[PDB]
């Protein structure tokens, strides 16, 4: 008859919530990250169909926390602009977006003060009949970004700790929700750029097959629709001004950087080819129509909200600014290049954190950024018109949706190497997932050997991960030891197989079924078997002592 046999290193897994670590004086690519692995091993799991859900992927929330945590830490040692909150006597420089302001500054010696001046943008100034104050003075103290930092969105690779694995959905037309017949396993993600933006997603990944439109629920007009493009659209933005910096000493080793202007003033703007955009829009509308088969499609401007939403926000590698994209989110489009006007802020409120504020220093000389539009965020108007037309608008604001637009292909699971199966005996990477239980047993070492040390503000995470990996490893080894199966990969025991545990044919089990399928059926009695196995060894130990005593 059949007996219990223990297998260690079987290719099965379950959804898990763990912590991933960062693989590369940048603001994001900090010194605490590890070197990347230049050769990812995309092992194809043929005959394995995993189900993904980008809308419940904890990786996104983890990413969000990571980005913020780093940001805050990076600006920790930077100058706090406390003494800046003084009476501002301002005049003019009709592009009157810049005001020349004078104020009283406290010198190195507390007993002494003097006059000083700086150029500020109207957007950063609040009327207090020509006296003003800095906008932040009634909310919090803005921290001046350290003069020697880099805000370039250097791509970050996420890697799993030993015992865990990252699955990829390689189905180029996957909607981000459902089965992925085309699935592979990797140790790390690719390099994803921490691009902070709204409306139009820049410098992201392009679709590999076609334009894909995905959402949590198209029937829910309170949710955002994410569209990923296959063909990129070039957009170039520039700030054609002599923003000469000035160094103002505001304390004992604390320098404030003020803006100055040498020449004249021209508004910043973006340049996007009309013909290009038009084509992209037409293509997107077509795909939308497929979901909304008997209606017209119209693109309009933002319904309203904070500047950060109504306009296109992005970091041009320098000073942050916002552009008016009403010329793009439209139905009437010209072939000629479209110029979009923009405005610049010195005082920036990151994300949606109240009380958080940073001040950006001026960059001497002009700036020009060449970037690609890779996708965008749209929302649909509620209700329905007799005109049988649906209206879509730009939106965003929650950076999690930006991250979600890149990490949607990844899923994190934990490997459960210990399995039990019925056999006819009595005692005395992960590619095998697609193989049958029998054949899969020939790769137990290949898998098991990589479940311990595969790894060889981020510091604490790496340390925690290391400990966890050890705990799990030892736990399993302890069990194998107790059951008298130490050092074995396939261990036949002295416990008989139950009839209530399975009614499957032995041949089907080993020749047809895979370990994943088996687990889902036999797991019902996991603890039951373990208990019996422990009792068996106890019996054996006393029997050995009995014999030894002779």
């Amino acid at each position, epitope marked *: 008859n059949l007996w219990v046999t223990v297998y260690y290193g079987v290719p099965v897994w379950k959804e898990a919530k763990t912590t991933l670590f960062c693989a590369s004086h940048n603001v994001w690519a900090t010194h605490a990250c590890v070197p990347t692995d230049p050769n990812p091993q995309e092992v194809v799991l043929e005959n394995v169909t995993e189900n993904f859900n980008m809308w419940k992927n904890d990786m996104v929330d983890q990413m969000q926390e990571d980005v913020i945590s780093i940001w805050d830490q990076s600006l920790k040692p930077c100058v706090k602009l406390t003494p800046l909150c003084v009476t501002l006597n301002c005049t003019n420089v009709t592009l009157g977006e810049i005001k020349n302001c004078s104020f009283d500054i406290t010198t190195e010696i507390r007993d002494k003060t003097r006059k000083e001046y700086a150029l500020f943008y109207r957007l950063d100034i609040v009327p207090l009949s020509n006296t003003y104050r800095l906008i932040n003075c009634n909310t919090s103290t803005c921290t001046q970004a350290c003069p020697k930092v880099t805000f370039d969105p250097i791509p970050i690779h996420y890697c799993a700790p030993a015992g865990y694995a990252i699955l990829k959905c390689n189905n180029k037309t996957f909607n981000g929700k459902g089965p992925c017949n085309n699935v592979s396993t990797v140790q790390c993600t690719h390099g994803i750029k921490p691009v902070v933006s709204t409306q139009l997603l820049l410098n992201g990944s392009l679709a590999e097959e076609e334009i894909v439109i995905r959402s949590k629920n198209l*029937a*829910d*007009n*309170a949710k955002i629709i994410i569209v990923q493009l296959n063909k990129s659209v070039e957009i170039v933005c520039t700030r054609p001004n002599n923003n000469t910096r000035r160094s103002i000493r505001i304390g004992p080793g604390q320098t404030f950087y003020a803006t100055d202007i040498i020449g004249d003033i021209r508004q910043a703007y973006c340049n996007i080819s009309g013909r290009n955009w038009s084509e992209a829009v037409n293509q997107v509308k077509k795909k939308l129509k497929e979901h909304f088969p008997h209606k017209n499609i119209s693109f309009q401007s933002s*319904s*309203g*909200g*904070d500047l*950060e*939403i109504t306009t296109h926000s992005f970091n041009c590698g320098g000073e942050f600014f916002y552009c008016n994209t009403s010329g793009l989110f439209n139905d009437t489009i010209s072939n000629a290049t479209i110029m979009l006007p923009c405005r610049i802020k010195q005082i920036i409120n990151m994300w*949606q954190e*109240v009380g958080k504020c940073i001040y950006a220093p001026p960059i001497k000389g002009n700036i020009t950024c060449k970037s690609d539009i890779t996708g965008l965020l749209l*929302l649909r*108007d*509620g*209700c*329905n*018109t007799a005109n049988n037309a649906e*209206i879509f608008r730009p*939106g965003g*604001g*929650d950076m999690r949706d930006n991250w979600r637009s890149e990490l949607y292909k990844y899923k994190v699971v934990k490997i459960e190497p210990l399995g039990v199966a019925p056999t006819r005996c009595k005692r005395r990477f992960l590619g095998a997932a697609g193989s049958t239980m029998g054949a899969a047993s020939m790769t137990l070492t290949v898998q098991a050997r990589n479940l311990l040390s595969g790894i060889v503000v981020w510091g604490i995470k790496q340390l925690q991960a290391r400990v966890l990996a050890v705990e799990r490893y030892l736990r399993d080894q302890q069990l194998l030891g107790i059951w008298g199966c130490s050092g074995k990969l396939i261990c036949c025991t002295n416990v008989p197989w139950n009839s209530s545990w399975s009614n499957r044919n032995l041949s089907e089990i080993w020749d047809n079924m895979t370990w994943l399928q088996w687990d889902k059926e036999i797991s019902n009695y996991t603890q039951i078997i373990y208990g019996l196995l422990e009792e068996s060894q106890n019996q054996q130990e006393k029997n050995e002592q009995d014999l030894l005593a002779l």
Partner: antibody, heavy 119, light 100 residues
């Protein structure tokens, strides 16, 4: 507990505009979307739109586009709605409402007293 | 779009009895439904959500079920206090409701 407190009833002349406030308490103001819906005087309810206090983002019912606008002030946990070009058919009780869960926010578990506006 | 229809428009019922209220839609919405109680001069109150779950403070005798495009609210042990208007809701779409 939580509650929504709306302004009192108001009477305007046709063509004019009305402003209706709604103060929230008992929870994080920016935790959930605020919805506006009006109850017609002897008929079913008609959804107006909603606002997201985190960014002031809005979504208006198509039929009122260009007539209604919404905003907010987080410092006083108060939402605001305004309707211009008022008509006689706009007479209704405008309710301030909040959903139960941040995930499915259409479950309007929490309601204000409603504000009656006429011409 | 989604158009919700309920019936019977009105129901003259007595205490202790049982009755149900239908709700239909032209499109499948799985189970994302809600039912609201409406009394004269009062604010709307959530009764049932997900077409299965009772709202806070709602007695067990209030239930309902449905799927896809055909849903129904069920109320047992009817009371005089139930003589109100009940609405069927899906997303921003409100039905006409019925009166007991």
């Amino acid at each position: 507990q939580v509650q929504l407190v709306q302004s009192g009833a108001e009477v305007k002349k046709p063509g004019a505009s009305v402003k209706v406030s709604c103060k929230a308490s008992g929870y994080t103001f920016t935790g959930y979307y605020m919805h506006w819906v009006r109850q017609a005087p002897g008929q079913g309810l008609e959804w107006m739109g909603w606002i997201n206090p985190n960014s002031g983002g809005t979504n208006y019912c198509q039929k009122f586009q260009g007539r209604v606008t919404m905003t907010r002030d987080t410092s006083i946990s108060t939402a605001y709605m305004e309707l211009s070009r008022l008509r006689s058919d706009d007479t209704a009780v405008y309710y301030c409402a909040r959903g139960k869960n941040s995930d499915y926010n259409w479950d309007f578990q929490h309601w204000g007293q409603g504000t009656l506006v006429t011409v | 779009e989604i158009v919700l229809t309920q019936s019977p428009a009105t129901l003259s019922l007595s205490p202790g009895e049982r009755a149900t209220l239908s709700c239909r839609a032209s499109q499948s919405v799985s189970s994302y439904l809600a039912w609201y109680q409406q009394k004269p001069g009062q604010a709307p109150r959530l009764l049932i959500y997900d077409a299965s779950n009772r709202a806070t403070g709602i007695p067990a005798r209030f239930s309902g079920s449905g799927s896809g495009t055909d849903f129904t609210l069920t109320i047992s042990s009817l009371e005089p206090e139930d003589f109100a208007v009940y609405y069927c809701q899906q997303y921003e779409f409100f039905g006409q409701g019925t009166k007991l």
